[PDB]
Every structure is written in structure tokens, then in C-alpha cells.
Write an enzyme that holds these catalytic residues in place. Structure first.
Site, mmCIF file in Angstrom:
data_model
loop_
_atom_site.group_PDB
_atom_site.id
_atom_site.type_symbol
_atom_site.label_atom_id
_atom_site.label_comp_id
_atom_site.label_asym_id
_atom_site.label_seq_id
_atom_site.Cartn_x
_atom_site.Cartn_y
_atom_site.Cartn_z
ATOM 1 N N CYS A 43 41.491 -29.856 5.080
ATOM 2 C CA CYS A 43 42.891 -30.073 5.444
ATOM 3 C C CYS A 43 43.814 -29.823 4.258
ATOM 4 C CB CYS A 43 43.106 -31.489 5.997
ATOM 5 S SG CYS A 43 44.823 -31.916 6.395
ATOM 6 N N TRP B 237 51.624 -32.276 11.494
ATOM 7 C CA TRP B 237 52.524 -31.199 11.878
ATOM 8 C C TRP B 237 51.960 -29.819 11.459
ATOM 9 C CZ3 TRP B 237 54.380 -35.265 8.715
ATOM 10 C CH2 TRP B 237 54.415 -34.986 7.337
ATOM 11 N N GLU C 231 49.121 -21.328 11.340
ATOM 12 C CA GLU C 231 48.192 -21.768 12.380
ATOM 13 C C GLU C 231 48.577 -21.146 13.720
ATOM 14 O OE1 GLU C 231 46.721 -26.102 12.200
ATOM 15 O OE2 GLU C 231 48.543 -26.194 10.963
ATOM 16 N N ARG D 269 46.918 -32.796 3.043
ATOM 17 C CA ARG D 269 46.539 -34.102 2.495
ATOM 18 C C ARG D 269 47.470 -34.793 1.492
ATOM 19 N NH1 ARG D 269 40.610 -33.366 0.494
ATOM 20 N NH2 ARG D 269 41.267 -31.164 0.279
HETATM 21 C C1 HEM Z 1 50.630 -33.957 8.052
HETATM 22 C C2 HEM Z 1 50.576 -32.624 8.176
HETATM 23 C C3 HEM Z 1 49.227 -31.860 8.184
HETATM 24 C C4 HEM Z 1 49.098 -30.571 7.871
HETATM 25 C C5 HEM Z 1 50.219 -29.624 7.400
HETATM 26 C C6 HEM Z 1 47.706 -30.202 8.024
HETATM 27 C C7 HEM Z 1 47.187 -28.950 7.772
HETATM 28 C C8 HEM Z 1 45.949 -28.530 8.190
HETATM 29 C C9 HEM Z 1 45.534 -27.166 8.451
HETATM 30 C C10 HEM Z 1 46.406 -25.894 8.319
HETATM 31 C C11 HEM Z 1 44.260 -27.200 8.836
HETATM 32 C C12 HEM Z 1 43.424 -25.964 9.231
HETATM 33 C C13 HEM Z 1 43.119 -26.048 10.728
HETATM 34 C C14 HEM Z 1 42.448 -24.776 11.201
HETATM 35 O O1 HEM Z 1 42.691 -23.679 10.600
HETATM 36 O O2 HEM Z 1 41.671 -24.865 12.198
HETATM 37 C C15 HEM Z 1 43.815 -28.581 8.833
HETATM 38 C C16 HEM Z 1 42.564 -29.066 9.142
HETATM 39 C C17 HEM Z 1 42.199 -30.410 9.170
HETATM 40 N N1 HEM Z 1 43.035 -31.515 8.995
HETATM 41 FE FE1 HEM Z 1 45.036 -31.442 8.663
HETATM 42 N N2 HEM Z 1 47.005 -31.315 8.462
HETATM 43 C C18 HEM Z 1 47.910 -32.362 8.569
HETATM 44 C C19 HEM Z 1 47.595 -33.632 9.011
HETATM 45 C C20 HEM Z 1 46.324 -34.151 9.125
HETATM 46 C C21 HEM Z 1 45.979 -35.522 9.454
HETATM 47 C C22 HEM Z 1 47.045 -36.591 9.769
HETATM 48 C C23 HEM Z 1 44.639 -35.627 9.450
HETATM 49 C C24 HEM Z 1 43.719 -36.839 9.722
HETATM 50 C C25 HEM Z 1 44.163 -38.099 9.780
HETATM 51 C C26 HEM Z 1 44.117 -34.322 9.111
HETATM 52 C C27 HEM Z 1 42.800 -33.990 8.988
HETATM 53 C C28 HEM Z 1 42.315 -32.710 9.093
HETATM 54 C C29 HEM Z 1 40.932 -32.421 9.322
HETATM 55 C C30 HEM Z 1 39.797 -33.445 9.487
HETATM 56 C C31 HEM Z 1 40.854 -30.903 9.376
HETATM 57 C C32 HEM Z 1 39.593 -30.071 9.627
HETATM 58 C C33 HEM Z 1 39.663 -29.706 11.105
HETATM 59 C C34 HEM Z 1 38.446 -28.911 11.482
HETATM 60 O O3 HEM Z 1 37.500 -28.843 10.649
HETATM 61 O O4 HEM Z 1 38.443 -28.347 12.611
HETATM 62 N N3 HEM Z 1 45.160 -33.445 8.930
HETATM 63 N N4 HEM Z 1 44.877 -29.365 8.429
HETATM 64 N N1 LIG Z 2 34.215 -26.962 15.090
HETATM 65 C C1 LIG Z 2 35.170 -26.324 14.943
HETATM 66 C C2 LIG Z 2 36.246 -25.635 14.787
HETATM 67 C C3 LIG Z 2 36.188 -24.287 14.455
HETATM 68 C C4 LIG Z 2 37.368 -23.564 14.300
HETATM 69 C C5 LIG Z 2 38.608 -24.177 14.470
HETATM 70 C C6 LIG Z 2 38.657 -25.525 14.805
HETATM 71 C C7 LIG Z 2 39.975 -26.229 14.987
HETATM 72 N N2 LIG Z 2 40.103 -27.181 13.870
HETATM 73 C C8 LIG Z 2 41.384 -27.893 13.953
HETATM 74 C C9 LIG Z 2 42.469 -26.945 14.415
HETATM 75 C C10 LIG Z 2 43.721 -27.757 14.549
HETATM 76 C C11 LIG Z 2 44.522 -27.611 15.670
HETATM 77 C C12 LIG Z 2 45.676 -28.377 15.766
HETATM 78 N N3 LIG Z 2 45.984 -29.244 14.800
HETATM 79 C C13 LIG Z 2 45.184 -29.371 13.721
HETATM 80 N N4 LIG Z 2 45.529 -30.245 12.784
HETATM 81 C C14 LIG Z 2 46.408 -31.213 13.034
HETATM 82 C C15 LIG Z 2 46.497 -31.875 11.825
HETATM 83 N N5 LIG Z 2 45.662 -31.240 10.961
HETATM 84 C C16 LIG Z 2 45.040 -30.194 11.546
HETATM 85 N N6 LIG Z 2 44.054 -28.639 13.583
HETATM 86 C C17 LIG Z 2 37.482 -26.250 14.965
#
Ligand code: HEM
Ligand SMILES: N#Cc1cccc(CNCCc2ccnc(-n3ccnc3)n2)c1
Ligand code: HEM
Ligand SMILES: N#Cc1cccc(CNCCc2ccnc(-n3ccnc3)n2)c1
Ligand SMILES: C[C@H](O)[C@H](O)[C@H]1CNc2nc(N)[nH]c(=O)c2N1
Ligand SMILES: C[C@H](O)[C@H](O)[C@H]1CNc2nc(N)[nH]c(=O)c2N1
Ligand SMILES: [Zn+2]
Lengths: 413, 408
Positions: free
Chosen positions: A111, A283, A288, A114
């Protein structure tokens, strides 16, 4: 394992020193002889497995609040121990639950958002017992987090897993996504990523409008029971029609997206407890939507249609017509969100804040796990600072984990 | 165990068996991944390395366990025994250099691996010799614009005191100058090297694109300056197919990309001097060379001339300007009949090459971090391609800049 690991930024020459990696709890997939850093993915716990996992977390919690070794600390350790012995599990205090969710986000290597980890509204929904109850909690999350466009990060945590035959699960991969319908002719209407899930919904009784941007219903599973459909009230689903500051014709494409990005298929692990239903939301980074949702060939795949409207030479690839459309589309996404006053961050600003965040983490925590492959935006990589930043990947706990899709494991009643 | 790699766009699944062959480390451990970290003999050590290489050489020519294979093993053992080293046959040198290319995790152009012109410069003894060899390399590789891949291989290491080294990191690069007002004229990445050249006698033109002289060390001796004859140095004036004002930026680049600072390891022998060259993927110039903040840093200038709104980052003005620069670079090279590949075409070829490698070799080591182009990542197919990274030998390795080792 070495005590100090150094990473370097190659454009600023900054060198940071990592000690936090020593607290690594899980395997990464890599070995001494192979690196799996670009691989996407490289029944319950016994009492004996749970004891040290619980202590690890509790110690960590009392360490965070500067009460390590205290009476309250020792007392809590003892309470948790007895609870595990007599019930084979334990319940987290509300304070611990909040600490654990905030830290699972803090530890999320993938993420980029963070910097915001400590400002997270945690809705405790461990008292929930039915899918109707889950729907209520989910609606309240959406309204709170949307906040009329001024998004605020949030997580709702449903009850932890017990025996594995009573999991709560949100079957949706995100709280809000659009449907995808396969046509008899091979073409897809809507979002091709969501075809399988849409088929399940339609089977469960959902009457589909069959459009390009149909908000999927929630599919909610409580206490191991069969899942149930609920339509989120439309007035709670904030959406942004996509237009372009220069090209008037861009609105004619009829694109839109939803404002609230909310992951709902992950599993939250805290002190050995598994919260299999834990929808969280923040957000959007513009890329994305503008790069992945819109331009991936297996998604909306609009590059051709946009480039065609831009009257670009589309015969050779060396005209970079794809590249030109990609930028305009991302410009449009950022412009549309900012115009309708819906929070969104561009990939330059987000990656710059992440670098600042990462440096602070090294200063105050002795490290910050990051997955370069995910952290680097999917467009214009090297013109953002994360590209030039060396990063270490390693899995701390509490953490967000992947889990099997529920339709593949569910025992239908 | 066998490992699967999946393409998430196409859903193609390849099975890696090749990784089981590797013995060198990658830097990761089971608990920490260092996939984005830039950089993570004796008689006794030498023979098993020799034997390994000879064995895979005779295996690749379906003469494993043959009389020739047996005699060769004997020959190499005797030679290490009596000299502490040994000399590669010509065939082995070529096989070894092609396979070092083939095994190069970070190189996206490996579909071309077996089309490699190997120049054996092992008879070299002096820096004048080195310069002659390099000029021939440059002239052959450049080929009037129809670039041909080449490597020139100077004598292997002996005691470490007698290394052959190309001090330049590339054969053709531009000087860099620290201006009195704190700024940098030309290429900032070469400021140090330029100063070493100047200290050594080189009279610098002090312009923005001055081709640096060669600094050649032979047999552990002090390096010597040589000017590549200009007629051997093909250069492209960068212009844009719509923006007529673009040529007024005065940008130019050189046509021949030739890495000269690496070390080629074959059968435990170390070739500290082995300049190799291919042709450019457009992004190397248009994205990194031209647009890194620590490099030519032109985005601001270009976006200025494009009259873009540069007040906010969310206007993506950088991204816009970036695409145009890279359009210009491709257009220019192509207009001059100088070989160049765009990142779409190149990555496509790489996916094809991966599939080829999996079929006939059971795998292909690859560094996703390096393979993915530094712009428009996910609209190229490599972004969606799982890649396994592992270290096979023969191999191109990094080595110290020689001005941190050499005594004068
Ligand atoms: C507040 C604004 C936030 C932004 C700008 C942000 C940004 C991002 C982005 C761009 C990704 C890539 C997703 C993808 O390409 O599939 C991501 C993944 C992720 N984010 Fe965030 N995020 C935010 C909030 C959060 C919050 C609130 C949490 C948890 C409490 C979180 C936990 C995660 C996790 C666990 C992933 C990995 C998702 C996956 O592996 O599919 N994020 N984040
Ligand atoms: N497993 C798996 C797997 C492989 C490719 C993309 C995926 C999506 N991961 C999160 C994508 C996604 C979508 C909307 N929102 C957010 N999100 C919101 C806050 N932080 C991230 N993330 C999962
Ligand atoms: C034939 C056309 C070729 C193309 C299009 C190509 C493409 C590339 C590119 C784009 C890089 C990344 C460079 C960087 O970002 O620093 C690279 C790296 C590399 N290439 Fe090539 N290459 C070609 C030929 C060759 C040849 C002929 C060899 C060796 C005989 C070779 C060996 C390597 C090695 C060892 C690296 C890693 C460089 C490093 O670690 O700094 N390549 N290649
Ligand atoms: N050490 C080091 C180190 C770290 C990052 C990039 C670097 C340069 N890599 C090569 C760049 C370059 C230049 C000209 N030509 C080529 N090239 C040609 C064919 N293959 C690569 N590559 C070195
Ligand atoms: C194969 C590769 O790991 C895969 O395509 C990854 C690459 N990096 C990514 N990075 C982000 N942020 N999101 C993704 O979905 C992916 N996909
Ligand atoms: C820190 C990081 O490893 C570094 O910036 C890398 C990223 N990927 C790269 N990829 C290529 N092709 N070339 C590079 O120089 C780099 N630099
Ligand atoms: Zn790794």
C-alpha cells in the site's frame, strides 16, 4: 541474518538503515537462490500455536503504549492465556483491535497510502450475527467513509473465525464495483474482471440491468451461513463522470467511476486471530482508475477508442499513441474527481508522500516494508521518486492477507 | 520443486525447472526480499567452476561424455594444476559470452542472444592495443546505423594486480562539468570521470554533449587517453514530428549503446574488460538519460516549450512532456536509419523470448524491476508477467569503478 540492512535512494543518494526486518514473522517466497518478488502470490489454529502468537502481539501492544512490563501488561497476558486454555481462543480489547488494524495497514508492503496509517476509523462489528446486520454495518461504513466526497479511511471488522465453519465473509472483492456480463458472442459488457462474480449474483437472484456501469449488489455471509444479496442504496454510492479539461468530446465516451475504493476480500490477522471479513477503504490514486481499471486489456480497455477520438496515428507502436492516450485519460480522471470535490491523489504527490513516510518510518521504527513492484505506479515510473528508491520486502504482523475466494470453499446449506 | 509463472493478462502459465541449476546467490532470504536492491580465485575453487562450464558446454553440443569432452576436462585440470589458471578454447569463449548475455536477468533484449559477434582480444598487451580493438568493435557494431550486437573480450584476470579495464562505463558517453554557479553542464552522471580525464590531460570542449575520450588500462598499468575518431561515432540530432521547435532544444544522443564497466565470468575465469553493445530501447534515452533529475533533466524545459500548466502536479504535465520526448527520440533515430526499438515492441519480443526459453530451456531468469520500462509500465505486457529471478553462470557481473582500486 544481518542486524543492519541499508537501502539507498539512487537520485538523492540518501541511505537508510533497517532493523525492523529482524521482526519479520512470515516467509516471502524468496530463497537464497531465487527471488519471487514479482510473483503475485508466492481449518483453524490449535491452542499451542495460538499462545505465542497472542503473547507476541500483546507484548507489542503494551510496548507501543509504553507500559511494557507493567501490572496491566502482565495481567492482560494472564487473562489471554486462561482464555485460550478454556475456550481455545480469545477476544481482543477494543483498544487492541484498533491498534491491530492500524498496524496491519502500517505493515502493508503493497500500500502506497500508508502515510495515513494512524488516521483510520475502526468500526468494531464483532457483535454482528446476520447478513442483514453486516449490510447495516457496511452501509454505515460507506456513508462515513464517503463523507460527501471528503473521503476518510475506515475499516469494519466482523467477528473473527472460530472453527472455520462459521466464517463471516464479504463475497465481493470490493464493496463497490461494476458488473461484467459475458455475451453469447464473446464480447464483455461492463467490467470483465467481475464476470464470474456477476454470474454468481445473477444465480443468487439478482436481476441485472445489464449496463456498462452497474453497481454490483453486496453478497454477504454471516456465521458460515449461505450468503445473501442486498442492494446498497444508490444515494450512498458516490460516482464521478469522467470528462477532460481540454477535449470536449471526452464526456461523450460516457465513462464514470465510483469515488470510494474499498477492499473487502482480504483477511485481517491480529495476534493469531483471523478476521475473514474486514472491509477497508481509503481514497484513490488516479492511476488505479486511469491506468489499470480503464486501460488494462482485460478490463475496460479504452485506449483504442480514446486514441481514435484523439485522431492519433495508430499503425506503428513507435508513435507511442498508446502512451499519449494513457496520459490524457489519467488527466481526465484527476480533473473529474477534483471538479466534483471527491478526494483523489495523483501518482506524483502520492509517491512523494510515501518517500517522506518511508523515511520517517526508518527514523522512528527502524524500517518500513515496501513492495517496489506494487509501490511504483503503473505509468511514468521513473519520473516518480519511488522508482529510484531501494526497498526491502518482509511481512510483519498484524497484517492483511489474501484468502481463497469464498465460492470455492463454501459448504452450501 | 517446479515453479509456475503466470501472465495475468493472457493467463499463460509457464513451468520453471531451470532455476534448479543455479548455485549463485540473489541476496534474498526466506524472510526478506531484496528484489529492488541495486547490488545485493585459487586452484581449488577454480576446477569445479571449470568442470561445470565445460560440462554444460559439451552438453549444449550433444557431445556429453564424448572423447572430446573427456580429453578437454583432462586438459583443463592439467592446465590449472600447472599454471593456477587455464585458457578457454575459441568455441568456449563464444559459447560463454553468448550465454552470459542469455543469462542476463536485467536485459530485455535477450531474444537476440545467439546473434552476438564475439571479438577475441585475448592477445592484447597494451592500451594502444585496447583502443585498436575498441575502434574495430565500434565500427563493426555501428555499421552505418544498422546496428549489430558485439562484445570484445580482453585478457582475463590473473593476480588482480594486472587487470585490463575500460575505465569509461560506456564506450560512448557525454562529459559532465561542475559550473562555478553550482550547476552541471552536460551529463551529471559523468562529472567525476570527466574530471579524471581532464586531470589526465584531456582538453575538454566544455559543451553539453562532448564525446568523452577512452581511458584504457592494460595489464594493471596506468590508464591512457584516446579519442575515438569522430567518424566512428554516430550521433542522432533529436527532433519532433509535430513540434518544429523541438530541434531548437539542441538535444542529441549517440547511436551506439555499449556497456564497458562490467565483468564477464566464464568457468570461473574473470574478464574484467569486456565492452559489449547492442542497440537502444528508446526509453533508455527518452526516459532515463533525458528525464532523470540526476541526469539531463529536460522535462521542465520541454513542458515549458509545450506551454503546459506546470503549477500543479495533478496536471500530469511531466507525463505529457515525457511522452513527447520519447516520441521525438524514436522518430529521430528512425528518420536517420539508426537502429532503435520502442518499449512496446521490445517487451512484446521479450514475452516471446520468455516463452521460447521456457520451451527449450525450462525457464528464463528475469528481473521484473529492470525488465519493465520506466514509463507506461502496465500498458506493456511484461508488467503483467510473473518473472522468476535467479543467477545462472556464465554471467555479467558488476565490479568496482577502477579509480577506487587502482594505485598509480
Ligand atoms: C488512504 C488512502 C490510500 C491510498 C492512496 C492507498 C493506495 C493504495 C494503492 C494504489 C494500492 C495498490 C492497489 C492495486 O494496485 O491493486 C494499495 C494497496 C493496498 N492497500 Fe492501500 N491505500 C489507501 C488506504 C488504505 C487503507 C485504509 C488500508 C487498510 C486499512 C490499506 C491497505 C492496503 C492493502 C492491504 C493493499 C494491498 C491490496 C492487495 O494486495 O490487493 N490501504 N493501496
Ligand atoms: N489477490 C489479488 C489481487 C490481485 C490483483 C489486484 C488486486 C486488488 N488489490 C486491491 C485493489 C484495490 C481496489 C480498490 N481499492 C483499493 N484500496 C483501497 C485502499 N487501498 C487500496 N485497492 C488483488
Ligand atoms: C540487442 C539489443 C539489446 C537491447 C534492446 C538491450 C536492452 C537492454 C536494456 C533496455 C537494458 C537496461 C539498461 C539500464 O536500464 O541500465 C539492458 C541491460 C543489460 N544488457 Fe542489454 N540489450 C541489448 C543487447 C545486449 C547485449 C549484446 C548484451 C551482452 C552481450 C547485453 C547484456 C546486458 C546486461 C548484462 C544488462 C545489465 C546492465 C546492468 O546491470 O547495468 N544486452 N539491456
Ligand atoms: N553499477 C551499476 C549500474 C546501475 C544501474 C545502471 C547501470 C547502467 N546499466 C547499463 C546502461 C546501458 C548503457 C548503454 N548500453 C546499455 N546496454 C546496451 C545493451 N544492453 C545494455 N546499457 C549500471
Ligand atoms: C506480474 C506482476 O507481479 C503483476 O502484474 C503486478 C505488478 N505490480 C502491480 N502493482 C500494483 N500496484 N498493482 C498490481 O496489480 C500489480 N500487478
Ligand atoms: C532502486 C531500483 O532498484 C532502481 O531505481 C532500479 C529500478 N529499475 C531499473 N530498471 C532498469 N531497466 N534500469 C535501472 O537502472 C533501474 N533502476
Ligand atoms: Zn526476492
Amino acid at each position: 541474518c544481518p542486524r543492519f540492512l541499508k537501502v539507498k535512494n539512487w537520485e538523492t543518494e540518501v541511505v537508510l538503515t533497517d532493523t525492523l526486518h529482524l521482526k519479520s514473522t512470515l516467509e516471502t517466497g524468496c530463497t537464497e537462490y531465487i527471488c519471487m518478488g514479482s510473483i503475485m502470490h508466492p481449518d483453524v489454529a490449535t491452542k499451542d500455536q495460538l499462545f505465542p502468537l497472542a503473547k507476541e502481539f500483546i507484548d507489542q501492544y503494551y510496548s507501543s503504549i509504553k507500559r511494557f512490563g507493567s501490572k496491566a501488561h502482565m495481567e492482560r497476558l494472564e487473562e489471554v492465556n486462561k482464555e485460550i486454555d478454556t475456550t481455545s481462543t480469545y477476544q481482543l480489547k477494543d483498544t487492541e483491535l484498533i491498534y491491530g488494524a492500524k498496524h496491519a495497514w502500517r505493515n502493508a508492503s503493497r500500500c502506497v497510502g500508508r502515510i495515513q496509517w494512524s488516521k483510520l476509523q475502526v468500526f468494531d462489528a464483532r457483535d454482528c450475527t446476520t447478513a442483514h446486520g453486516m449490510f447495516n454495518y457496511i452501509c454505515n461504513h460507506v456513508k462515513y467513509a464517503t463523507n460527501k466526497g471528503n473521503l476518510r479511511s475506515a475499516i469494519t471488522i466482523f467477528p473473527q473465525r472460530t472453527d472455520g465453519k462459521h466464517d463471516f465473509r464479504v463475497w465481493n472483492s470490493q464493496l463497490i464495483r461494476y458488473a461484467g456480463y459475458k455475451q453469447p458472442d464473446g464480447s464483455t459488457l461492463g467490467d470483465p474482471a467481475n464476470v464470474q462474480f456477476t454470474e454468481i449474483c445473477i444465480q443468487q437472484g439478482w436481476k441485472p440491468p445489464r449496463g456498462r456501469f452497474d453497481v454490483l449488489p453486496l453478497l454477504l455471509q454471516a456465521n458460515g451461513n449461505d450468503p445473501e444479496l442486498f442492494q446498497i442504496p444508490p444515494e450512498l454510492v458516490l460516482e464521478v463522470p469522467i470528462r477532460h479539461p481540454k477535449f470536449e468530446w471526452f464526456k461523450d465516451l460516457g465513462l464514470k467511476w465510483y469515488g470510494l475504493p474499498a477492499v473487502s476480500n482480504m483477511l485481517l490477522e491480529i495476534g493469531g486471530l483471523e478476521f475473514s471479513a474486514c472491509p477497508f477503504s481509503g481514497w484513490y490514486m488516479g492511476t488505479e482508475i486511469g491506468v489499470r481499471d480503464y486501460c488494462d486489456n482485460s478490463r475496460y480497455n479504452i485506449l483504442e477508442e480514446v486514441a481514435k477520438k484523439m485522431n492519433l496515428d495508430m499503425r506503428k507502436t513507435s508513435s507511442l499513441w498508446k502512451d499519449q492516450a494513457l496520459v490524457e485519460i489519467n488527466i481526465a480522471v484527476l480533473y473529474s474527481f477534483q471538479s466534483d470535490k471527491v478526494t483523489i491523489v495523483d501518482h506524483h504527490s502520492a509517491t512523494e508522500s510515501f518517500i517522506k513516510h518511508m523515511e520517517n518510518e526508518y527514523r522512528c521504527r527502524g524500517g518500513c516494508p515496501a513492495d517496489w513492484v506494487w509501490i511504483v505506479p503503473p505509468m511514468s515510473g521513473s519520473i516518480t521518486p519511488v522508482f529510484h528508491q531501494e526497498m526491502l520486502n518482509y511481512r510483519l504482523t498484524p497484517s492483511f492477507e489474501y484468502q481463497p475466494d469464498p465460492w470455492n470453499t463454501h459448504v452450501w446449506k
